[PDB]
């Protein structure tokens, strides 16, 4: 009868960390991903990996 107690508190914080993690994931991703694209150099990196396709596809 005692333990259910304790276990809830843990389970809450575990669930709370996941509902942070989801809200974090969505918000963090939704904040810091929009701005990135000013890198034309993410396409120099597309370019880079693409030369490592065009080269490294042999």
């Amino acid at each position: 009868e005692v333990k259910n107690r304790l276990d809830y508190h843990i389970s809450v914080q575990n669930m709370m960390r996941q509902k942070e993690q989801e809200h974090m994931i969505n918000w963090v991703e939704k904040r810091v991903v929009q701005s990135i694209s000013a890198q034309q150099e993410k396409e120099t990196i597309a370019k880079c990996i693409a030369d490592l396709k065009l080269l490294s596809k042999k």
Binding site: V2, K3, R5, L6, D7, H9, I10, Q13
Partner: peptide
């Protein structure tokens, strides 16, 4: 174990 793991903590210890 629960001493660590209950983080309305000292509950397990108190208990």
């Amino acid at each position: 174990y629960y001493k660590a793991n209950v983080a309305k903590a000292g509950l397990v210890d108190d208990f």
